[PDB]
C-alpha cells in the first residue's frame, strides 16, 4: 500500500482504536478572555484522534451538556457502510440526549488531515471540534509532523447568545481570532472582569534545515484565511483528504472546513517570523482581523515579536486555483446525469437561504435515516432531498442566485467530489457543461461556490445513504443553506446492532424533548 493505492477501492487492514469523548460545558481562557465553551474534554481544540489508514475507530461520545442535544461528525470521513455514524442530527441520527452516550464506529479508509466537530446546530462555534489525523502516504518527504494548526474566528461569548441577532441576516463581527486555540487580546482598558489578559500568540518553533509537515484547517464560524508564513514557502501536498501533486505557494487561501497539508522547509535566516492567517476582510468582518497571526521562532528562548515583512495577500475569498489542485491518484469522471440547484434567500421568522426555494429544516426526532428505515421514499420538502439512483456519476451544479457575492464553502458528506467547474459566471445548462474538466479535476470535500457564480461537483454513486451537502459557514448552515442526496436508498445496508443503537438514541432524545429548556430554532444542522 502506497501513495498510488486507490483508497476508494482498496483499504489496509488496521487495528481497532477506541476513544471516549465527553461533550462538556466548559470555561476557558484561550486568548486572555474567559468565557463559556462547549468542548470535547474541556479543551479547545478537542483531543486528537489519531489513527492509521485502515483502522477501525470506536468513539464513545457522552453528552454531558445539560441543555442541548449533540451529534458528532467526522468531517470528510467517507462512512461507506457506516452511514449512521456520520454524525448529522436530523439526517443520520437523532441528537444524543443529555446524559446519553452514542458510540460511533467506522473504518478510516482515507488518510490525511481532517477534524471532527459537532453538527448539532452551532455547537462547533463554541469550541466543539478537534483534530482527526490519519497516518498514511504523502506526496513529498518531510522530517517532522507538527500536526494541526486550526484557524478560526473566536467570539467572547456563546455563539448561541448571538444567534438571534445573526439570524436577522448579518453575521456579527466576532471579538477575536485564534490560531491553534490561542491568541493575544488587549484587556488593558476593559471593565469586563472576564478580560483577564495574558493571551499569547500561537508559537511554532523551527530547527533550521528541518522539513515540517503543517496540517492547516479553517474551523471558523464565518472566516476565510489565506495562511502565510513570512519568508517561507508552502509546498502543498494535500487538499482535504486527497493527496495532490506538490506545488509551492507563498500564501494559501483556505475556506471553512477545508484542510491543506503543507511542507515547510525551515531554510530561512534564523529569526522570528510572522505567521499570517490573513483574515479575509472582504469575506467577513472581525474586530481584530489584523491580529489573526502567530509566531514562527527558530530560537525558542526568543520572546521577541517578529518584525518580518510578509507577502502581499491575494486578499480574495477564493479557493486555491483549480489548476494548482491536481490529485496524485488521477481519476476521471464518467458519464453523468446533471443535477442543477439554485441558492437564493428569503425571510420568514428570520433570514433563510433556499435551495430551489426551500430552506432546509430538519426534524431532529425524525432524521432522514429513520425515515429510510421506515421505507419512506418521499421526504418533507424542507428536507431538500435529491434522490439519486444509477451513468454512475452525478454532476451537481450549485448556483449562487443570491446576488450576495459570498464565496460559500460547500461541503459534501459521504464523498470526495470532483471540481469539474468552479466558475465566477452565470451557469448555462446548454453551454457550461461543455467547459467542465472531467480529467483528473481537483478532488476534495469542501469547495467554494463562488459568489454570484456556480460550483459544479461530480461524485460517483458508490455510497448508498443520506448525505448532507451544505454551506460550512455556521450561520448559513443554521440558516438552511443545505440539501441532502438520498443515494440508492434501497441499497443502504445497516446492521441490526446499529439499528438498535440508532433507535435507542432516538428513544432517549424523545424522552428528552418534552422537558427541553430550548427548542430547535435553526435548520437543525
Ligand atoms: C495545535 O494544538 C494541538 C493541541 O490542541 C497539538 O496537538 C498535538 O498534535 C501532535 C502532532 O499531531 C501530537 O503529537 C503526537 O502524539 C501522538 C499521540 O499522543 C499520545 O497518545 C498515545 C496513544 O494513546 C494511548 O495508546 C497507548 C498504546 O499505544 C496507551 O499506552 C495509552 O494509555 C493510550 O491508550 C489508548 O488509546 C488508544 C487510542 O489512542 C486506544 O486504542 C486504547 O483503548 C486506549 O484508550 C501515547 O502513546 C502517548 O504517550 C501520547 O499520550 C504520538 O503517537 C505521535 O507520534 C506524536 O508525538 C500531540 O500529542 C498533540 N498534543 C495535544 C495536547 O493534543 C498540535 O501539535 C498543535 N499544533 C502545533 C503546530 O503546535
Ligand atoms: C443549546 O444550549 C444553549 C445554552 O448554552 C442555548 O442558548 C440559548 O439560546 C437562547 C435562544 O436563542 C438564547 O436566548 C436569546 O438570548 C439573546 C441574547 O441575550 C436575546 O437577544 C434573545 O432575545 C434570546 O432570549 C439564550 O441567550 C442562549 N443562552 C446562552 C447561555 O447562550 C441554546 O438555545 C440551546 N439550543 C438547543 C437547540 O437546545
Ligand atoms: C474524555 O473525558 C471522559 C469523561 O471524563 C473520559 O472518560 C475520557 O477518557 C476522556 N478522553 C480523553 C481522550 O481524554
Ligand atoms: C452551560 O452552562 C451555562 C452556564 O451555567 C448554562 O446557562 C447553559 O445552559 C449550559 N449550556 C448547555 C448547552 O447545557
Ligand atoms: C494587534 O493587537 C494589539 C492589541 O490591541 C495591537 O497593539 C496591535 O497593533 C494589533 N495589530 C494590528 C491592529 O495590526
Ligand atoms: C432547480 O431549479 C432549476 C430552475 O428552475 C431547475 O433547472 C432544476 O432542475 C431544479 N432542480 C431540482 C433538483 O429540482
Ligand atoms: C421496510 O422494508 C423491509 C423489506 O420489505 C421490511 O422487512 C421492513 O419490515 C420494512 N419496514 C417497515 C414497513 O416499517
Ligand atoms: C498552483 O498552480 C497553478 C497552475 O500551475 C498556478 O496557476 C497557481 O498560481 C498555483 O501555482
Ligand atoms: Cu441548568
Ligand atoms: Cu465539517
Ligand atoms: Cu462533513
Ligand atoms: Cu454560505
Ligand atoms: Cu456537514
CSV table of N, CA and C and ligand atoms in Angstrom, one decimal, residues 73-77 86 88 114-115 117 119 411-414 445-446 468 470 472, ligand 11:
chain,number,residue,atom,x,y,z
A,73,UNK,N,-19.8,14.8,14.1
A,73,UNK,CA,-19.5,14.5,12.7
A,73,UNK,C,-17.9,14.4,12.5
A,74,UNK,N,-17.6,13.4,11.7
A,74,UNK,CA,-16.2,13.1,11.3
A,74,UNK,C,-16.0,13.6,9.9
A,75,UNK,N,-15.4,14.9,9.8
A,75,UNK,CA,-15.5,15.6,8.6
A,75,UNK,C,-14.7,15.0,7.5
A,76,UNK,N,-15.4,14.7,6.4
A,76,UNK,CA,-14.7,14.2,5.2
A,76,UNK,C,-14.5,12.7,5.2
A,77,UNK,N,-14.9,12.1,6.4
A,77,UNK,CA,-14.9,10.6,6.5
A,77,UNK,C,-16.0,10.0,5.7
A,86,UNK,N,-22.3,9.0,10.7
A,86,UNK,CA,-21.8,10.3,10.1
A,86,UNK,C,-22.0,11.5,11.0
A,88,UNK,N,-24.7,13.5,11.6
A,88,UNK,CA,-25.6,14.6,11.3
A,88,UNK,C,-27.0,14.5,12.0
A,114,UNK,N,-8.0,15.8,8.8
A,114,UNK,CA,-9.3,16.3,9.0
A,114,UNK,C,-9.5,16.6,10.4
A,115,UNK,N,-10.8,16.8,10.7
A,115,UNK,CA,-11.3,17.2,12.0
A,115,UNK,C,-12.6,16.5,12.3
A,117,UNK,N,-16.3,17.5,14.6
A,117,UNK,CA,-16.9,18.6,15.2
A,117,UNK,C,-18.4,18.3,15.5
A,119,UNK,N,-22.2,18.6,14.8
A,119,UNK,CA,-23.0,19.0,13.7
A,119,UNK,C,-24.4,19.4,14.2
A,411,UNK,N,-19.7,21.9,1.5
A,411,UNK,CA,-19.3,20.6,2.0
A,411,UNK,C,-20.2,19.5,1.6
A,412,UNK,N,-19.7,18.5,1.0
A,412,UNK,CA,-20.4,17.2,0.7
A,412,UNK,C,-20.1,16.1,1.7
A,413,UNK,N,-21.1,15.5,2.3
A,413,UNK,CA,-20.9,14.3,3.2
A,413,UNK,C,-20.9,13.0,2.3
A,414,UNK,N,-20.2,12.0,2.8
A,414,UNK,CA,-20.1,10.7,2.2
A,414,UNK,C,-19.2,10.5,1.0
A,445,UNK,N,-13.4,17.7,-0.4
A,445,UNK,CA,-14.8,17.6,0.2
A,445,UNK,C,-15.4,18.9,0.6
A,446,UNK,N,-14.6,20.0,0.6
A,446,UNK,CA,-15.1,21.4,0.7
A,446,UNK,C,-14.5,22.2,-0.5
A,468,UNK,N,-25.8,14.9,3.6
A,468,UNK,CA,-26.0,16.3,3.6
A,468,UNK,C,-24.9,17.0,2.8
A,470,UNK,N,-23.9,21.1,2.3
A,470,UNK,CA,-24.3,22.4,3.0
A,470,UNK,C,-23.1,23.4,2.9
A,472,UNK,N,-20.6,25.4,4.8
A,472,UNK,CA,-19.9,25.2,6.0
A,472,UNK,C,-19.8,26.5,6.9
B,11,LIG,CU1,-18.6,16.6,6.7
